Design a protein around this ligand. Structure first.
Ligand code: IUM
Lengths: 102, 96
């Protein structure tokens, strides 16, 4: 559809994993027509604290890399991107919210 | 329009509820509706959506026997009833 938000993901606090732990798959149906590469930006991804969340560039699978405590940041606001071979975005970026729950 | 895909919703089989039980919120002023088997097509009224918030809920415990996976479509219209964006597919798996 033309523009819908991805439902927030709830992640239990101080999970035992193991890590990396897959959370959800974020991708576009356009990837069945064009070669697309997925990326994630925002605090937790490429902004502090870095490397907590990663996304598989081909599948769109989003994963957590370590246990998370709620004291410092209890909610992360990321943005997933879908880009063609020249790097042009083929979808408007989409917001991803990860809530750390106790 | 956009073609981002909404992640499948996994719902435990024969849940205790209480009911209605909140599942997920699907949103884009606007009014939301859901169509398909389980919503407005048989078995009707199992899944319902709040027209303002987009909150999708389930109304009773579900057994996997008859239907284990539902395919619905969420719709968004302006206050005049005009569709403002392409409908979006929603998938619900009843997990045991
Ligand atoms: O376990 U504590 O925020």
């Amino acid at each position: 559809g033309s523009d819908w938000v991805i439902p927030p993901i709830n992640l239990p606090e101080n999970s035992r994993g193991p890590f990396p732990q897959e959370l959800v798959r974020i991708r576009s149906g356009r990837d069945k027509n064009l070669s697309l590469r997925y990326s994630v930006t925002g605090p937790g991804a490429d902004q502090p604290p870095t490397g907590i969340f990663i996304i598989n560039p081909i599948s769109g699978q989003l994963s957590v890399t370590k246990p998370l405590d709620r004291e410092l940041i209890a909610r992360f606001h990321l943005r997933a991107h879908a880009v063609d071979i020249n790097g042009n975005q083929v979808e408007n970026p989409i917001d991803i919210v990860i809530n750390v729950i106790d």
